[PDB]
Design a protein around this ligand. Structure first.
Ligand SMILES: OC[C@H]1O[C@H](Oc2c[nH]c3ccc(Br)c(Cl)c23)[C@@H](O)[C@@H](O)[C@@H]1O
Ligand SMILES: OC[C@H]1O[C@H](Oc2c[nH]c3ccc(Br)c(Cl)c23)[C@@H](O)[C@@H](O)[C@@H]1O
Ligand SMILES: OC[C@H]1O[C@H](Oc2c[nH]c3ccc(Br)c(Cl)c23)[C@@H](O)[C@@H](O)[C@@H]1O
Ligand SMILES: OC[C@H]1O[C@H](Oc2c[nH]c3ccc(Br)c(Cl)c23)[C@@H](O)[C@@H](O)[C@@H]1O
Ligand SMILES: [Ca+2]
Ligand SMILES: [Ca+2]
Ligand SMILES: [Ca+2]
Ligand SMILES: [Ca+2]
Ligand SMILES: [Mn+2]
Ligand SMILES: [Mn+2]
Ligand SMILES: [Mn+2]
Ligand SMILES: [Mn+2]
Lengths: 232, 232, 232, 232
């Protein structure tokens, strides 16, 4: 059972398992039920931009989500990630659709990791090549002709499908801590396009971190964002 | 048969297959016989520092090697790497020993890759963890307790062994070009410690680039620097 | 460049690169141009059955192809496979379509390997599971709902597409020889269904053997049966 | 957390976690505490021979262990393995040493798997090649010059070391059941040589079956036989 730290743009309120009454960004520490959430002023059809940061000195995983010239949405959570995640991990983006759907388009994805014990891993994508050998595409994750990472299924038309799960891991494992390490930090940006024919888009996109061999958990569809085998 | 672009710190003169009469840095385009070389003022026992750069606009692979406060050694070569290397590659460091030996210690290794079509892959190591999951260690390559990448065999004493070959690839494939790409560049630094009981150290260390599935070619020992199956 | 030993059911005559004037079974030793061929009495729409055998004592790779109660077609070739193939290999089935097409259905596939130095590897498939984890499916190779290995593309209708290449490797590398080995033999059976709307079906199906890391060579489509990067 | 079905030749009594008072063979269904055990008349220095069988109709995992012309030791357990193990698995041999040690030599290892829904996977080893590419060697598992699989560490002298863990998985995943399958069976033989300077040899050898991605669990040393992260 994978260890998971995710920042969720939870498109779909699932009150029956923790979610607030509304679209929200959440910080998930080994549970789909977010340790912290903020009301996310969704804007379907516009391009969102998530920034994620954290160092091991401040011990505060923080995420902001924004649209151009629009009021942003921040959510923080005091956590020491080296007590949660293994020493080595892989970073990725996941997204699902349930009975309700939405395009989970990733227009770009950067991520910087620093381990001053000064080791480092930076990577950024503004274009997603047809064959991304530096990405372990899991489930329904693919890349379209516009150089966009489609995390979840989308017809040739552009319409999103439902009951789809897909994630993109960066091929190289990251080293986010070492007993010796004085400070391990990481940042993570990505822009996304969420479009939906439904007035209740679902289910969400997330940037997560996990055991290197992390794979899509069975039953992880929909409100589970392809991160957990259950809702505990 | 792998495609190979390497920058060699050729410790050992092998005149009988191209090498100059002396220790030298070479730029190898799909051949152990360097398209360009410069006389390398070796300093066994001191820590060297190779810087490598190249963009696709200038089309000039250049490398400099230096010791602290000592006269450096530069070597350049006009080449268009996208006509040589495949679209996707893996970057690494190799080193061998023949009948003559030497420690092939890598104290650090950074590498930045930029694909403005602005995609990117940066990674740097000042410490090499006991288990580097973000490095495909090939052959005799291992990491010692001092956090140093030993490319080639070295007894517990510290003495180097001979007839050893070892390389370190970064786990993630790099994208160094795209038909669309306007400019693909990359830099690569690394510091090394070459020590030898022999007054004729051998055989050398190299930073190379290759087809992603690049592996140590049979017969690639010694003067082949674990890069080629032959000397053509 | 992979080492390849294949037994080809060459559906399509390609005279301009060696092929006989007619559909034929060929034995290919590191070349699409068969060292031996026999006239293959094709029967599109009926289920064929290839048996392949060889031991290192007799040094005779032999293949027979048959349809129920129909005159079979045998082809032999005296070769010592341990002088051709590496010590370790992977066994598989490949098939392509060019401008002309055909279904490349594999209804079953067994293979026995014996290394008396008595080591062994047997595997047989009468059903191909939706997710064959014990098969490295390459290119357009997939498995349909009838439990059939579709080597090459086929519409939902059942019509075959063209310019498609796909192979199925057995996940485990086989050990087909050892310097010590007294006798290494192997057999290989498989039944196939070739159907075509075209009166000139193309291009063929093959059981091949190759370096373990064998992958579909670029330009290997059509008359190359997804085995060679060229016709030499 | 891996799913594990093992047949243990538990060299070392660990009463404080279930073990009988004596060396024994056990059948472990997702727990180091055997669902069934029989008193194992150990014979250190002689070559043992374990036979394992099971089909899904009888639903009885059975194992026998024997030495030449010596009273054997049988242990059975009524279990339906398709309710325990995933649909796809990898089969292997594991062994550890704790504060007490012993050579865990595997002189041979066969295994037949049949899935009549008649699919099959057979493999046998009487010799273990220096580089067994068809074996995922985990931990301290290696192969010596006599063609023997040393599961656990052994000095050049031949003396076994302690606190060592090593397993050998067959490279190809096995298909041990399918919803459709009418009967899935498997057999598994292997001969072993257990030698110890200690009058209380430890800890044991096992043939196990697990989720394909099974790896040595942390803390699985000694009485855990490199199968479980704990003793529950
Ligand atoms: O796409 C959003 C969701 O759809 C499903 O839950 C549903 C939310 N509204 C519903 C209305 C009816 C039924 Br039945 C279901 Cl399962 C749901 C589920 O598939 C969820 O996993 C998911 O959160
Ligand atoms: O370590 C350096 C070299 O040693 C060998 O070549 C030798 C250079 N000096 C020699 C002197 C005698 C003999 Br025999 C040999 Cl092979 C050599 C070879 O093993 C080379 O590959 C290598 O370049
Ligand atoms: O499907 C069979 C074949 O089709 C092609 O060659 C053709 C055989 N008949 C033709 C007629 C016209 C043209 Br243009 C072509 Cl390329 C061909 C090629 O694509 C071949 O690789 C292949 O053997
Ligand atoms: O090799 C056998 C065993 O050695 C250890 O347990 C010991 C059995 N006898 C002992 C006596 C003292 C101490 Br401290 C220990 Cl840990 C043990 C442990 O390391 C066990 O995992 C193992 O079963
Ligand atoms: Ca939700
Ligand atoms: Ca040289
Ligand atoms: Ca042909
Ligand atoms: Ca025990
Ligand atoms: Mn939520
Ligand atoms: Mn040189
Ligand atoms: Mn032919
Ligand atoms: Mn026990």
């Amino acid at each position: 059972a994978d260890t998971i730290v995710a920042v969720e743009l939870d498109s779909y309120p699932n009150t029956d398992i923790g979610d607030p009454n509304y679209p929200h960004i959440g910080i998930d520490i080994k549970s789909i039920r977010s340790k912290s959430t903020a009301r996310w002023n969704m804007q379907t059809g516009k391009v969102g931009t998530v920034h994620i940061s954290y160092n091991s000195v401040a011990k505060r995983l923080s995420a902001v989500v924004s649209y151009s010239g629009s009021s942003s949405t921040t959510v923080s959570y005091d956590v020491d990630l080296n007590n949660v995640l293994p020493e080595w991990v892989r970073v990725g983006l996941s997204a699902t659709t349930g009975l309700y759907k939405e395009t989970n388009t990733i227009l770009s994805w950067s991520f910087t990791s620093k381990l001053k014990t000064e080791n480092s891993l930076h990577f950024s994508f503004h274009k997603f090549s047809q064959n991304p050998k530096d990405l372990i595409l899991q489930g329904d994750a693919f890349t379209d002709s516009d150089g966009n990472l489609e995390l979840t299924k989308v017809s040739s038309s552009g319409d999103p499908q439902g009951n789809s799960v897909g994630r993109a891991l960066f091929y190289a494992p990251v080293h986010i801590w070492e007993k010796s390490a004085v400070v391990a930090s990481f940042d993570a940006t990505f822009t996304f396009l969420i479009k939906s024919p439904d007035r209740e888009p679902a289910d969400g996109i997330t940037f997560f971190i996990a055991n290197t061999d992390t794979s899509i958990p069975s039953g992880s569809g929909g409100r589970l964002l392809g991160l957990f085998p259950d809702a505990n």
